[PDB]
mmCIF file with all atom_site columns, C-alpha atoms in Angstrom:
data_model
loop_
_atom_site.group_PDB
_atom_site.id
_atom_site.type_symbol
_atom_site.label_atom_id
_atom_site.label_alt_id
_atom_site.label_comp_id
_atom_site.label_asym_id
_atom_site.label_entity_id
_atom_site.label_seq_id
_atom_site.pdbx_PDB_ins_code
_atom_site.Cartn_x
_atom_site.Cartn_y
_atom_site.Cartn_z
_atom_site.occupancy
_atom_site.B_iso_or_equiv
_atom_site.pdbx_formal_charge
_atom_site.auth_seq_id
_atom_site.auth_comp_id
_atom_site.auth_asym_id
_atom_site.auth_atom_id
_atom_site.pdbx_PDB_model_num
ATOM 1   C CA . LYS A 1 1  ? 95.485  20.488  -60.671 1.00 48.40 ? 1  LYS A CA 1
ATOM 2   C CA . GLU A 1 2  ? 95.521  19.186  -64.168 1.00 46.61 ? 2  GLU A CA 1
ATOM 3   C CA . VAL A 1 3  ? 97.773  16.319  -63.198 1.00 48.06 ? 3  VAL A CA 1
ATOM 4   C CA . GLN A 1 4  ? 95.352  15.458  -60.395 1.00 48.07 ? 4  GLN A CA 1
ATOM 5   C CA . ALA A 1 5  ? 92.542  15.278  -62.958 1.00 47.02 ? 5  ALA A CA 1
ATOM 6   C CA . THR A 1 6  ? 94.536  12.886  -65.068 1.00 47.72 ? 6  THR A CA 1
ATOM 7   C CA . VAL A 1 7  ? 95.162  10.637  -62.076 1.00 45.04 ? 7  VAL A CA 1
ATOM 8   C CA . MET A 1 8  ? 91.488  10.612  -61.437 1.00 49.57 ? 8  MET A CA 1
ATOM 9   C CA . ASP A 1 9  ? 90.584  9.556   -65.010 1.00 48.35 ? 9  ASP A CA 1
ATOM 10  C CA . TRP A 1 10 ? 93.109  6.707   -64.816 1.00 48.22 ? 10 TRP A CA 1
ATOM 11  C CA . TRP A 1 11 ? 91.527  5.380   -61.625 1.00 45.75 ? 11 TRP A CA 1
ATOM 12  C CA . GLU A 1 12 ? 87.723  5.696   -62.584 1.00 45.51 ? 12 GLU A CA 1
ATOM 13  C CA . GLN A 1 13 ? 87.962  4.807   -66.369 1.00 45.45 ? 13 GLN A CA 1
ATOM 14  C CA . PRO A 1 14 ? 84.627  6.584   -67.221 1.00 43.88 ? 14 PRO A CA 1
ATOM 15  C CA . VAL A 1 15 ? 84.568  5.447   -70.851 1.00 43.10 ? 15 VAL A CA 1
ATOM 16  C CA . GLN A 1 16 ? 83.015  1.960   -69.710 1.00 42.95 ? 16 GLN A CA 1
ATOM 17  C CA . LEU A 1 17 ? 79.483  3.615   -69.120 1.00 45.81 ? 17 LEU A CA 1
ATOM 18  C CA . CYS A 1 18 ? 79.271  5.390   -72.437 1.00 45.84 ? 18 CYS A CA 1
ATOM 19  C CA . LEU A 1 19 ? 77.262  2.595   -74.387 1.00 43.70 ? 19 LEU A CA 1
ATOM 20  C CA . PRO A 1 20 ? 74.503  1.247   -72.000 1.00 46.97 ? 20 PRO A CA 1
ATOM 21  C CA . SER A 1 21 ? 72.184  -0.354  -74.634 1.00 46.81 ? 21 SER A CA 1
ATOM 22  C CA . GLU A 1 22 ? 74.812  -2.556  -76.124 1.00 48.16 ? 22 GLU A CA 1
ATOM 23  C CA . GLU A 1 23 ? 74.206  -6.208  -75.438 1.00 52.41 ? 23 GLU A CA 1
ATOM 24  C CA . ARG A 1 24 ? 76.596  -8.989  -75.800 1.00 50.64 ? 24 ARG A CA 1
ATOM 25  C CA . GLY A 1 25 ? 75.695  -12.610 -74.899 1.00 50.02 ? 25 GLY A CA 1
ATOM 26  C CA . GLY A 1 26 ? 72.078  -11.289 -74.247 1.00 48.20 ? 26 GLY A CA 1
ATOM 27  C CA . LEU A 1 27 ? 73.339  -8.970  -71.351 1.00 49.69 ? 27 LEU A CA 1
ATOM 28  C CA . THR A 1 28 ? 74.592  -5.274  -71.085 1.00 50.76 ? 28 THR A CA 1
ATOM 29  C CA . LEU A 1 29 ? 78.143  -4.363  -69.639 1.00 51.58 ? 29 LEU A CA 1
ATOM 30  C CA . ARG A 1 30 ? 76.569  -3.193  -66.495 1.00 53.59 ? 30 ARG A CA 1
ATOM 31  C CA . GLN A 1 31 ? 74.871  -6.524  -66.180 1.00 55.90 ? 31 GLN A CA 1
ATOM 32  C CA . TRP A 1 32 ? 78.007  -8.268  -66.776 1.00 58.30 ? 32 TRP A CA 1
ATOM 33  C CA . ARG A 1 33 ? 79.760  -6.092  -64.120 1.00 59.47 ? 33 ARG A CA 1
ATOM 34  C CA . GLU A 1 34 ? 76.987  -6.789  -61.786 1.00 58.82 ? 34 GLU A CA 1
ATOM 35  C CA . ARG A 1 35 ? 77.325  -10.472 -62.448 1.00 54.24 ? 35 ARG A CA 1
ATOM 36  C CA . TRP A 1 36 ? 80.966  -10.131 -61.786 1.00 52.96 ? 36 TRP A CA 1
ATOM 37  C CA . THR A 1 37 ? 80.460  -8.127  -58.533 1.00 55.05 ? 37 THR A CA 1
ATOM 38  C CA . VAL A 1 38 ? 77.920  -10.871 -57.314 1.00 52.89 ? 38 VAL A CA 1
ATOM 39  C CA . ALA A 1 39 ? 80.248  -13.603 -58.173 1.00 52.92 ? 39 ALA A CA 1
ATOM 40  C CA . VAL A 1 40 ? 83.220  -11.819 -56.567 1.00 52.35 ? 40 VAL A CA 1
ATOM 41  C CA . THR A 1 41 ? 81.176  -11.171 -53.493 1.00 57.91 ? 41 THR A CA 1
ATOM 42  C CA . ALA A 1 42 ? 80.028  -14.923 -53.386 1.00 54.63 ? 42 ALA A CA 1
ATOM 43  C CA . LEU A 1 43 ? 83.566  -16.097 -53.742 1.00 52.22 ? 43 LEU A CA 1
ATOM 44  C CA . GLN A 1 44 ? 84.755  -13.790 -51.055 1.00 54.65 ? 44 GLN A CA 1
ATOM 45  C CA . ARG A 1 45 ? 81.846  -15.092 -48.752 1.00 51.95 ? 45 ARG A CA 1
ATOM 46  C CA . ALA A 1 46 ? 82.713  -18.820 -49.499 1.00 50.92 ? 46 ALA A CA 1
ATOM 47  C CA . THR A 1 47 ? 86.329  -18.398 -49.225 1.00 50.25 ? 47 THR A CA 1
ATOM 48  C CA . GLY A 1 48 ? 85.830  -17.179 -45.712 1.00 48.57 ? 48 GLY A CA 1
ATOM 49  C CA . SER A 1 49 ? 88.001  -14.763 -47.206 1.00 48.83 ? 49 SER A CA 1
ATOM 50  C CA . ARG A 1 50 ? 86.547  -11.828 -45.446 1.00 49.31 ? 50 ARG A CA 1
ATOM 51  C CA . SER A 1 51 ? 87.577  -9.157  -47.558 1.00 47.11 ? 51 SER A CA 1
ATOM 52  C CA . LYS B 2 1  ? 131.272 69.268  -45.685 1.00 46.01 ? 1  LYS B CA 1
ATOM 53  C CA . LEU B 2 2  ? 132.001 66.463  -43.345 1.00 42.76 ? 2  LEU B CA 1
ATOM 54  C CA . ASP B 2 3  ? 128.620 66.840  -41.709 1.00 40.64 ? 3  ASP B CA 1
ATOM 55  C CA . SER B 2 4  ? 126.909 66.787  -45.149 1.00 42.57 ? 4  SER B CA 1
ATOM 56  C CA . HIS B 2 5  ? 128.797 63.676  -46.280 1.00 40.86 ? 5  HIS B CA 1
ATOM 57  C CA . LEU B 2 6  ? 127.921 61.897  -43.130 1.00 41.63 ? 6  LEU B CA 1
ATOM 58  C CA . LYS B 2 7  ? 124.205 62.847  -43.358 1.00 43.40 ? 7  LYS B CA 1
ATOM 59  C CA . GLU B 2 8  ? 123.968 61.739  -47.061 1.00 41.41 ? 8  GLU B CA 1
ATOM 60  C CA . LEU B 2 9  ? 125.606 58.358  -46.500 1.00 39.76 ? 9  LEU B CA 1
ATOM 61  C CA . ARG B 2 10 ? 123.637 57.682  -43.366 1.00 39.30 ? 10 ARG B CA 1
ATOM 62  C CA . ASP B 2 11 ? 120.287 58.516  -45.084 1.00 38.67 ? 11 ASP B CA 1
ATOM 63  C CA . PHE B 2 12 ? 121.168 56.116  -47.819 1.00 34.00 ? 12 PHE B CA 1
ATOM 64  C CA . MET B 2 13 ? 122.116 53.234  -45.508 1.00 31.82 ? 13 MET B CA 1
ATOM 65  C CA . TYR B 2 14 ? 119.324 53.833  -43.002 1.00 34.39 ? 14 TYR B CA 1
ATOM 66  C CA . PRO B 2 15 ? 116.259 54.341  -45.147 1.00 33.77 ? 15 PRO B CA 1
ATOM 67  C CA . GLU B 2 16 ? 113.682 53.512  -42.256 1.00 35.04 ? 16 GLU B CA 1
ATOM 68  C CA . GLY B 2 17 ? 115.880 55.556  -39.832 1.00 37.42 ? 17 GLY B CA 1
ATOM 69  C CA . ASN B 2 18 ? 116.465 52.746  -37.312 1.00 36.79 ? 18 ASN B CA 1
ATOM 70  C CA . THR B 2 19 ? 118.070 49.845  -38.993 1.00 33.33 ? 19 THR B CA 1
ATOM 71  C CA . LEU B 2 20 ? 121.115 49.457  -41.140 1.00 33.06 ? 20 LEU B CA 1
ATOM 72  C CA . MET B 2 21 ? 119.797 48.071  -44.425 1.00 29.96 ? 21 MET B CA 1
ATOM 73  C CA . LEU B 2 22 ? 122.048 45.922  -46.523 1.00 24.22 ? 22 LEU B CA 1
ATOM 74  C CA . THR B 2 23 ? 119.457 44.570  -48.968 1.00 25.87 ? 23 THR B CA 1
ATOM 75  C CA . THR B 2 24 ? 117.162 46.530  -51.181 1.00 22.01 ? 24 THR B CA 1
ATOM 76  C CA . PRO B 2 25 ? 113.752 46.458  -49.398 1.00 19.98 ? 25 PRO B CA 1
ATOM 77  C CA . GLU B 2 26 ? 112.058 45.800  -52.706 1.00 20.98 ? 26 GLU B CA 1
ATOM 78  C CA . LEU B 2 27 ? 114.240 42.814  -53.300 1.00 21.15 ? 27 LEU B CA 1
ATOM 79  C CA . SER B 2 28 ? 113.907 41.467  -49.799 1.00 22.21 ? 28 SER B CA 1
ATOM 80  C CA . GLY B 2 29 ? 110.156 41.479  -50.205 1.00 18.73 ? 29 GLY B CA 1
ATOM 81  C CA . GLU B 2 30 ? 110.369 39.501  -53.461 1.00 17.20 ? 30 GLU B CA 1
ATOM 82  C CA . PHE B 2 31 ? 112.608 36.795  -51.923 1.00 16.93 ? 31 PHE B CA 1
ATOM 83  C CA . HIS B 2 32 ? 110.112 36.243  -49.206 1.00 18.73 ? 32 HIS B CA 1
ATOM 84  C CA . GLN B 2 33 ? 107.244 36.053  -51.677 1.00 19.14 ? 33 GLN B CA 1
ATOM 85  C CA . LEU B 2 34 ? 109.076 33.613  -53.925 1.00 19.98 ? 34 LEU B CA 1
ATOM 86  C CA . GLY B 2 35 ? 109.959 31.352  -50.945 1.00 19.64 ? 35 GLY B CA 1
ATOM 87  C CA . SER B 2 36 ? 106.365 31.242  -49.894 1.00 18.96 ? 36 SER B CA 1
ATOM 88  C CA . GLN B 2 37 ? 105.101 30.334  -53.363 1.00 22.88 ? 37 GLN B CA 1
ATOM 89  C CA . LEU B 2 38 ? 107.707 27.497  -53.696 1.00 25.04 ? 38 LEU B CA 1
ATOM 90  C CA . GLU B 2 39 ? 106.609 26.019  -50.429 1.00 24.29 ? 39 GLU B CA 1
ATOM 91  C CA . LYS B 2 40 ? 103.022 25.818  -51.754 1.00 23.34 ? 40 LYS B CA 1
ATOM 92  C CA . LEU B 2 41 ? 104.232 24.233  -55.007 1.00 24.43 ? 41 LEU B CA 1
ATOM 93  C CA . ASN B 2 42 ? 106.203 21.564  -53.020 1.00 22.05 ? 42 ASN B CA 1
ATOM 94  C CA . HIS B 2 43 ? 103.014 20.639  -51.031 1.00 23.19 ? 43 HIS B CA 1
ATOM 95  C CA . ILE B 2 44 ? 100.945 20.174  -54.074 1.00 24.26 ? 44 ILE B CA 1
ATOM 96  C CA . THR B 2 45 ? 103.689 17.938  -55.556 1.00 20.27 ? 45 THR B CA 1
ATOM 97  C CA . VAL B 2 46 ? 104.020 15.759  -52.474 1.00 19.85 ? 46 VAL B CA 1
ATOM 98  C CA . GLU B 2 47 ? 100.275 15.509  -52.204 1.00 22.44 ? 47 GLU B CA 1
ATOM 99  C CA . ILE B 2 48 ? 99.917  14.224  -55.835 1.00 22.73 ? 48 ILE B CA 1
ATOM 100 C CA . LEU B 2 49 ? 102.825 11.677  -55.502 1.00 19.14 ? 49 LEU B CA 1
ATOM 101 C CA . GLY B 2 50 ? 101.351 10.432  -52.313 1.00 19.39 ? 50 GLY B CA 1
#
């Protein structure tokens, strides 16, 4: 059960949400991730590449 | 004497009266329990690797 917990931590990497108010380049990590997710989604739409 | 020897040996070998017992019942029960627990451990292992 402990090993299963470790596998879970490796997959989710929870430490990325621990500093929300930190801005870099005028944006927070979340914002950056969001920007990334929108961009990844736009690329996937253009590149017909239906994920 | 012969009758007594026969009765003593028989009582020892047939503890539940109907079946010749070669293994100690207490031990036979433990083997079964250990086999069952190992099967559970093998499932958990396969599940995690998968």
